[PDB]
Structure formats: C-alpha cells, structure tokens
Design an enzyme around this catalytic site. Structure first.
Site: not given
Ligand SMILES: CN1CCN(Cc2ccc(C(=O)NO)cc2)CC1
Ligand SMILES: [K+]
Ligand SMILES: [Zn+2]
Ligand SMILES: [K+]
Length: 640
Positions: A137, A176
């Site tokens: 990300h 994601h």
């Molecule tokens: C349901 N939402 C979805 C996103 N979340 C924040 C988040 C959690 C995990 C990742 C990640 O990178 N996982 O591999 C990125 C952002 C908050 C609540």
């Molecule tokens: K992916």
């Molecule tokens: Zn993820």
C-alpha cells in the site's frame, strides 16, 4: 543450477507495535511474524531453508521508490515521543508509527533485496522473506495501510537496475489492492502487476475507482496492470483457481517474466477477519506451484498481510512446502466459480482482450468462530523419481532419481499374462514387471513419488498400468495421452478422465474425455499452453485424480511443452504420476525425469499467437464440457 530455498527473517522486525487506541490498526501485531516463523520451525521447514541475514536498505535504495521529502519525514520518527508519533500517523490512512518502525521498515526492505540477490545470483532457486511492516500500500510520498516503504516495488526496481531485467511479474494475492505497486508501475511495460482483491463495488478499503478491472495501465504500460476485484466475500478455492487458470496464468506465460515476485498476503485465507474469504491454506501450495515453471523457478515471496494467527501459520507453511518442492496436497470439492467471480473474471478478460493473445478471440464476433481441518502432512519422497530406461542404458540422473523385479511382482505378471494375455515377448513382459514394481513404490509406498518407464507395446502396458492402479485402489485416474489411435481405456464409469493430444480431429462424445487436435506449424507451442492452462488443468483439478498416467507414443514438436505439462500436472494426485514413453528418446526421457524430479523448467520465451483455428477448437471443447466441469467456466452462465 540453483538448489535450495532462502528464508529471510529477523526477530527485530517484531519489535514495533501500536502504542495507542486505534480500531483501524489493532490487527497488525508483532505476533504475525513470530507465529509464522515458529510454524515453519514446528514443521521442520525453516531448518530446510538457507537462512539469509537481513540488512538495512540504503538511502539510495529507498529513493528508487520514494521521494526525498517522504524519506526525510520518516527518518525523524525515531526521535518522536508517542504524542508526536500519533500526530505524524494521522497524516496518513490506516497506519501507525513507532520509534523503531523506521529501523524495521529499512530491514523489511533490505530483507527483500537480500532475497532478490540470493535468487538472481543463483545462490538459491527461490525464497521467502518474512517481514514487517508490509509494503504494497506504500506510495512515493505516503505511508498507507500499515505500509511504510514498498518492499515489493523495491525488489522489482532493484532487480531492473542491478540485473538489467526487462520483464518482471508481480503477483499480489493479498486480499487488499496493492495500489502502491500499481501506481509505481502503471506506465512501465517491463513490470506486469496482477492483483485480486476484496472490492465490493468500491465499498471496501481502500475504496478506489482505479482498483477496478478497467485500470489496465497507462501509456506504454497499457495492458501490464491487471486488477481482479472480488465484489462479494466468501471466495473459495474454486474462485481462486478460476482466477489463475483463466486470467493470471495465460497472461503470465505469454509475458514470460525473467523474475517472479509475490506480494504474499494471507489475509486472503479462510478465517481472516479482514478478508472474510473461504479459501483453504492448502490453496497457497497450488498458487505457488502453478507459478514455479515461470522464470526458471526464480520466485521471491514477500510477506504482506494475514491477521488470523492460525490461518496465517498454515498458509506460510503451505507456501514454503511448495518452494521446497514438496508434494502438493489434493484439493477436493472444486467446481464452478461463483457468479460474482465469473462476472469479475469475464469483465477483466474482456477489457484485457486488446492486449493479450489468450484473450484476443474475445474481441470479435467471428471468434466469440471460523474453524477448518488442519492440513495433512507433506513429506518429500525418499527418492522422488524412479526411472526404468531400456535394458543396458544407464543415464546421468539427478541426485533424487534412481533406477528401479521382486518375486511377488513376477508372480503377478505371470497371472496377468495367463488370464488376459498370447504374449511371450520377454521384454514387454519385463515392461509389465517394471510398471507394477514402480506403481507399488508410488501408491502403497510413501518412499517414492513418481516414475517414468520406457515401453514397447502401448496397449498391454497402458492396460496393465491402468488396471493395476484402479485395484490398488486409486479412486480416480487422470490419463494424459499424446498420440493417435485408441487405448485400452474405458471412460464409462467416472473413475477415468482421458485427455488426448492428437493429430487427427476426433469428435468427442462424452464428458469424461477431452480430445485436442492441434494444427501443424509454429503455433503448436502457444496453442498447447492455451489448452493446458484453460482446459486441461481446470478439468484435472476438478476431477482430483489419485494418480496421473502419462503416455507418449513414439512419433516431437511437443518436446518443447512436455516439461511444463509434467511440472504443472504434478499439482494433481500429490505429484503421483507414472509416465510411459513408447520407445527410447533420450532427450524426451531426460526431460521427463528432469520435470518429474522437481528441477526447474526452462522458459518458453515470449509466446507467439495461437492459430485461430486452434482457439475455436478449444472454445468448442469448453462449451461442450463446462456444464459438467464448472471450473472450466470463464463467463457467467445464462439463466433460463
Ligand atoms: C474494514 N476496514 C478495512 C481496512 N481497515 C484498515 C486496514 C486493514 C488492513 C490493511 C492491510 O493491509 N491488510 O493486509 C489495510 C487497511 C480498516 C477497516
Ligand atoms: K492483492
Ligand atoms: Zn492485505
Ligand atoms: K506495469
């Protein structure tokens, strides 16, 4: 050629954590790393990998992917107290900082570069980096979603600069979207980025329009960005495999990368609270396995997410098991992808039809809590492959292959000839002794995994192999036959599926036979691969055989695809495959043994275009079989 598997890990990357209340970040914890490495140790996998030390990425390495302004900002976080760390974190979306996270981010990135160097220098065949913080990300000037620096983006940019690579494939199987990687390479045709991801029509984080299937890259990068959005949760093994057979693999084998990097988040696994998908840990053994014939096996697996500690450890082990060449687990209960997945798959294939030959036929009408069973044990065979060359001929075998008749087996041969065969050719009777001996060492054994026998008479050899397998008993047998004419093979009870690659166009009648007649000329290679990825493997995976029987009749243009098939076909029946070669051809025999033994497959080269004649033949086969074998589907079916 390269041998083992690198494992890159350091305890130091578990020494940063969240220091305040934030429900958006509570799930990213140091135990993710500790639990995953401890599961590799428990299963004896870490001990079997080459441990490679972590290092810090250098400032100039970080600047390959990030701006001086952002690096300078992150460089100040070690001096911040908690209040300042909280203020700094709130400038970004779903990420927290810690006095030691800059140090750990440098180690996660350097760990990834260490893996790239170990693989590109041929010190190992492949490897995995277990790192925190994750990377995909992360963006040029922003931390995002637990990520500080874009580990996998580094790896590709580093490998381009330092090894002059022109084609790199990134597979992001995290649940994601890796938008940081997408942005990094969106205009770059040298890096093919594939991502599937929970999307739910943009309602799921990161909520981006450009995570949809219509983002294909920009400018000279058009076609080298492939997004597959999951618009419902609960995706299963069948959805994931359908995505591989009908989107990723056809494009990846056409791209022919020189290096494969995996953004390996296991939040796409059953039990994960972020992903809410239903795929079993065992599926990552197959996602890994299906990619390993690319780039001569040069694969760097980089940990991203995965938050269910149990689900996480099992998926990490299944991946390393596969990197080590251990036999893949059988996947049962496969069938059609669900309707939402078929919509996503059909939409991406359609938008990508302008850019990839596997999809080009689509562009014109002329061409059309949570629990689950613990994974079973995966033990590498004592001797992996047994070979029976013609009498006399000794061969130079890999360190894990071996030449092969007991008194008991000799009695069985005489029984069989007495009832069913009359024949006294004393060597095609030695054939039968070899087939029965090698099959017994495959099935009722555990010591041997697969084998190859050279034979004279196909009909009695095939019949003896098939019949001995069925009574062993192996519930189901997949037969893969390259040649013409009809074999002593009955497909009228469901226990046999026959794939046949032949030269004369045969009309198929029933749904337990797939007959592929491919035209003569230069495009036989691309046509075969299209058939293998889009027809043979879907049916074979749904069939789930207990034994694979391969058969080649004496009459050589497939001698360039046979290695890829016998490598990929080992994803069925736990790699238990017996190949019968009619007549001695030393090149084909040595290649068969090479691939059966787990050695790396040589690349095909960037793939040509298959003949439209062959694509029409293949899609007629799909239309004929996909109602029975739903894993063949790459479109939504019409409702009544
Ligand atoms: C349901 N939402 C979805 C996103 N979340 C924040 C988040 C959690 C995990 C990742 C990640 O990178 N996982 O591999 C990125 C952002 C908050 C609540
Ligand atoms: K992916
Ligand atoms: Zn993820
Ligand atoms: K790209």
């Amino acid at each position: 050629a390269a041998s083992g598997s690198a494992l890159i890990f350091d305890e130091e990357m578990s020494r940063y954590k969240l220091l305040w209340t934030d429900p958006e970040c509570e799930i990213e914890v140091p135990e993710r790393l500790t639990v995953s490495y401890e599961a590799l140790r428990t299963h004896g996998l870490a001990q079997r990998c080459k441990a490679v030390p972590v290092r810090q990425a250098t400032e100039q390495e970080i600047l390959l992917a990030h701006s001086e302004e952002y690096l300078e900002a992150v460089k100040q976080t070690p001096g911040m107290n908690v209040e300042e760390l909280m203020a700094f974190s709130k400038k970004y979306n779903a990420v927290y900082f810690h006095q030691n996270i800059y140090h750990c981010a440098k180690l996660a990135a350097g760990a990834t570069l260490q893996l790239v160097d170990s693989v590109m220098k041929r010190e190992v065949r492949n490897g995995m980096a277990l790192v925190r913080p994750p990377g995909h990300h992360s963006q040029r000037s922003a931390a995002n979603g637990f990520c500080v620096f874009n580990n996998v983006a580094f790896a590709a940019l580093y490998a381009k600069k330092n090894y002059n690579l022109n084609r790199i494939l990134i597979v992001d199987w995290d649940v994601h979207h890796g938008q940081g990687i997408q942005y990094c390479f969106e205009e770059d045709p040298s890096v093919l980025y594939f991502s599937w991801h929970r999307y739910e029509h943009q309602s799921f984080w990161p909520n981006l329009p450009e995570s949809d299937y219509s983002s294909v890259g920009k400018g000279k990068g058009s076609g080298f960005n492939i997004n597959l959005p999951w618009n419902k949760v609960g995706m299963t093994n069948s959805d994931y495999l359908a995505a591989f057979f009908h989107v990723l693999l056809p494009v990846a084998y056409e791209f022919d990368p020189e290096l494969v990097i995996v953004s390996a988040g296991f939040d796409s696994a059953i039990g994960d609270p972020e992903g809410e998908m239903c795929a079993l840990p065992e599926i990552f053994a197959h996602l890994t396995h299906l990619l390993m014939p690319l780039a001569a096996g040069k694969m760097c697996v980089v940990l991203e997410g995965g938050y269910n500690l149990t689900s996480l450890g099992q998926s990490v082990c299944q991946t390393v098991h596969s990197l080590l060449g251990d036999p893949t687990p059988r996947i049962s209960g496969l069938g059609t992808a669900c309707d939402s997945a078929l919509e996503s798959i059909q939409n991406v294939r359609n938008v990508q039809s302008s850019y990839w030959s596997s999809f080009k036929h689509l562009a014109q009408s002329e061409t059309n809590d949570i629990v689950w069973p613990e994974p079973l044990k995966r033990m590498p065979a004592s001797v992996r492959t047994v070979v029976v060359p013609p009498p006399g001929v000794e061969l130079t075998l890999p360190k894990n292959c071996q030449h092969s008749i007991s008194e008991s087996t000799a009695k069985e041969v005489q029984r069989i000839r007495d009832k069913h065969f009359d024949l006294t050719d004393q060597n095609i009777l030695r054939s039968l002794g070899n087939i029965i001996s090698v099959l017994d060492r495959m099935m009722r054994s555990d010591e041997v995994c697969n084998g190859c026998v050279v034979v004279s008479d196909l009909s009695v050899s095939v019949q003896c192999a098939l019949q001995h397998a069925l009574t062993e008993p192996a519930e189901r047998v997949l037969v893969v036959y390259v040649g013409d004419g009809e074999l002593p093979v009955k497909t009228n009870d469901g226990k046999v599926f026959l794939v046949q690659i032949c030269t004369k166009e045969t009309e198929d009648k029933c749904v337990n036979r797939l007959t592929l007649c491919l035209r003569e000329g230069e495009s036989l290679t691309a046509g075969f691969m299209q058939a293998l990825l889009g027809l043979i493997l879907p049916v074979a995976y749904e069939f789930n055989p207990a034994l694979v029987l391969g058969i080649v009749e004496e009459t050589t243009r497939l001698m360039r695809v046979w290695g890829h098939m016998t490598c990929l076909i080992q994803g069925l029946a736990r790699g238990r495959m017996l190949t019968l070669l009619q007549g001695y051809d030393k090149d084909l025999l040595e290649l068969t043994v090479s691939a059966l033994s787990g050695a790396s497959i040589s690349p095909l080269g960037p793939l040509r275009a298959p003949k439209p004649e062959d694509v029409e033949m293949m899609e007629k086969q799909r239309q004929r079989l996909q109602e029975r074998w739903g894993l063949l589907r790459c479109t939504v079916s019409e409702s009544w």
